[PDB]
A paper describes a structure:
EPDR1 is a member of the ependymin-related (EPDR) family of proteins. The crystal structure confirms that EPDR1 adopts the highly curved β-sheet fold that had been previously observed only in bacterial proteins. Two EPDR1 chains associate into a tight homodimer through extensive hydrophilic contacts between the convex surfaces of shelf-II. At acidic pH, EPDR1 can bind to liposomes that contain the anionic lipid bis-monoacylglycero-phosphate (BMP) or the ganglioside GM1, consistent with a role in the degradation or transport of lipids and/or lipoproteins within the lysosome.
We solved the deglycosylated form by Se-Met SAD phasing and used this structure to solve the glycosylated form by molecular replacement. Deglycosylated EPDR1 crystallized in a different packing arrangement with two independent homodimers per asymmetric unit. All three of the crystallographically independent EPDR1 homodimers (one dimer from crystals of the glycosylated protein, and two dimers from crystals of the deglycosylated protein) are similar to each other with Cα RSMDs less than 0.6 Å, indicating little variability within the chains and across the homodimer interface. The main difference between the structures from the two crystal forms is that no ligands were observed within the pockets in any of the deglycosylated structures, and we refer to the deglycosylated structures as apo-EPDR1. In addition to the empty ligand pockets, the loops at the mouth of the groove of apo-EPDR1 had weaker electron density. This is reflected in the higher atomic displacement parameters for loops L6 and L7, while L9, L4 and the C-terminal half of L12 (the latter two are linked by a disulfide bond between residues C88 and C222) could not be traced at all. We suggest that the ridge that lines the opening to the ligand groove is dynamic and flexible in apo-EPDR1 and becomes more ordered upon the binding of a ligand.
Residue numbers in the entry:
A (entry chain B): 39 to 81, 91 to 156, 160 to 211
B (entry chain A): 38 to 83, 90 to 155, 160 to 214
């Protein structure tokens, strides 16, 4: 069992759980791993994260008032690293209609990442970050379509200067 | 709106259950028998317990895999099947994965102050995930996989003889 190659360019939607708030938040997701840029649209904000630059933008969907700020965090792609240990492979659904998926744990320096990806074509289904086994942040992805249909989603409005 | 699917009421597979108090995921095998309202779960290493929940008899047993000490205590709360109640509000329909390798699923919220929200398959109504949340805190959530219908040998639900003597 060798890690697959997740698509580095796709659009879909996500449900993100945070333990601090303890909540799930649904949003659309534009993931561009080639340009290391990602934009999420709340389903009330829109966020545009440009990692090649040092900047992220937070936009009121109604107001367009834009707050720009240094990104701080380093880039972490939505794929399974080569040095990640294989944990399990299971099937979601059941007999007459199933996905086979696999689960991987990178354990990046006691913070550990654990991601579940589809087996043959490797769309991301879920990603979970956990500190000392206390699940800090988890996200599920669905309706994935490869590539970006309109890259203007990553260009900030003129409100952000 | 669409009409709820009726999930199979007898199947066995595996689960990972996340609990907000501990904040942890726990993997285990699961034998779900909704017809006899009995369910048995077997902890997986990834203090290793086995739980047998018999709702018709109102009794639950936790049995411990290493030593087989069984503790029997009365089942407090009522039975709730792994299906979508009829008065569930429909939330969304999704696709997991991508082209040629995917499943279409739907998410339902019954909201039986407590809210239940579970996502089940569209075409065959296999359960994929169950979530219980109090006032927007995720309290509990469990994901199911490797489901095969029916129960292979119902003896999975008979407690060990250590459990008969227990109090």
């Amino acid at each position: 069992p060798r890690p697959c190659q997740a698509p580095q360019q796709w659009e879909g939607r996500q449900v993100m759980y945070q333990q601090s708030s303890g909540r799930n938040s649904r949003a659309l997701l534009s993931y561009d791993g080639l340009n290391q840029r990602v934009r999420v649209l709340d389903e009330l904000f829109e966020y545009i994260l440009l990692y090649k630059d040092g900047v992220m933008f937070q936009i009121d969907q109604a107001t367009k008032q834009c707050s720009k700020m240094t990104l701080t965090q380093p880039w972490d792609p939505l794929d399974i690293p080569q040095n990640s240990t294989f944990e399990d492979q299971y099937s979601i659904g059941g007999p007459q209609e199933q996905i086979t998926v696999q689960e991987w744990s990178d354990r990046k320096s006691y913070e550990t990442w654990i991601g579940i990806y589809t087996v043959k074509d490797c769309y991301p289904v879920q990603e979970t970050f956990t500190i000392n086994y206390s699940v800090i942040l988890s996200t599920r992805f669905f309706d994935i379509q490869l590539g970006i249909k309109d890259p203007s989603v990553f260009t900030p409005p003129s409100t952000c200067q």
